[model samples]
Target: VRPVVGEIAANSIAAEAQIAPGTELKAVDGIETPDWDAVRLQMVDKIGDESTTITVAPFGSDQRRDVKLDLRHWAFEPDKEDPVSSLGIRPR
Candidate 1:
């Protein structure tokens, strides 16, 4: 998810609605997010001020929460290591 280089996450333009540490991201725009890589791909498609819908499975419950979010962005350095790019990268 490294959209840019040499930047630190000093701020976020806006936060994704209803996504919290304990919340499970069930889907994005009706697409089921099985893992974090899938979640990152979904995020890439949402550039600009896009209106996105997220379905959340609340932690410790069967309750479903729906959030409507406007995704405006600020630039930050992408993580040096991502799940997709981690394959075959053995350290010396």
Candidate 2:
């Protein structure tokens, strides 16, 4: 169950690093990100900032990763559609 504080709205994801859908944003700078909005707001406030390490917990995995992000052009828009396609599938 997602947390009531709109936990589905996480600020950013490790899209290129093999992170799965069920991973959770556990902390930022050692501060617990209990909800998605918290992570989003924090990232927005730090846009264009330098590198930072984020803690993430993968679903069903006891291990976690401290993801490193280079925030030179950080922006989050999960619902935005791609100009082309991302899933590599198209209706014929």
Candidate 3:
């Protein structure tokens, strides 16, 4: 299932990536997990990367495209809170 974006933090990496509400997340990095929980876990595994790639489609549509986001320069704080863990956002 495609997970829909619920909210995105202002001035965060997700915002810079243009991941706002109504965007549909199809995959994280290169893994297209079946659910949000699995997707979350997949993102967790990519914590060490300078950036992560996501596949997204607009809400109510099927055309998808890749979006690469730099995790190293996110607006979020601390090394403990990365983009996927903090600012990358979650589904409703």
Candidate 4:
């Protein structure tokens, strides 16, 4: 799975949702995330916000579920080497 979840930390948004590693991300705000570029870009589409939608399909099925994840935004400046993780979500 090229666009699965990876490296989620405890108490973080991903952790609270139980988005555990290997889950497939289908979309963000209805935008497709079938690749790394989309994952990185679509992630920031919700930056600076805590409540939003993320489309995902759990490891066992193809049914796309629109997940409303409660998030705790980044505590620091989002400008750095890693643009993909600006929203605290890393793709695998």
Best by TM-score: 3
lDDT of 3 at 55: 88
Ten contiguous residues with the weakest lDDT in model 1:
83-92
Candidate 1 C-alpha error for residue 89, in Å: 25
lDDT of each: 0.48, 0.50, 0.72, 0.67
Q: What is the lDDT of residue 77 in candidate 4?
A: 44
32-69 per-residue lDDT for model 4 (tens digits): 78887776676556666777677888877867777777
1-87 in candidate 3: lDDT tens per residue?
556788887877778888768887778877886667766677677656798888888777778878887778644344455434476
Worst 10 residues of 4 by lDDT: 75-84
Using lDDT as the yardstick, the better of models 1 and 2 is: 2
Which parts of model 4 have CA positions greater than 4 angstroms off?
81-90
In angstroms, the error of model 4 at 38 is 0.8
Cα displacement (angstroms), candidate 3, residue 86, comes to 0.5
TM-score of every model versus the real structure: 0.59, 0.60, 0.77, 0.73
Tally clashing residue pairs in candidate 1. Answer: 0
lDDT of 1 by residue, 1-92 (tens): 21111211222221324344345667768888876667567755654534677676755678987777555332233454342122111111
- Residue pairs in clash, model 4: none
Per-residue alpha-carbon lDDT of candidate 2 for residues 2-71, written as tens digits (9 for 90 to 100): 2121122233334443444566667767767776556655555554567656677777688978877655
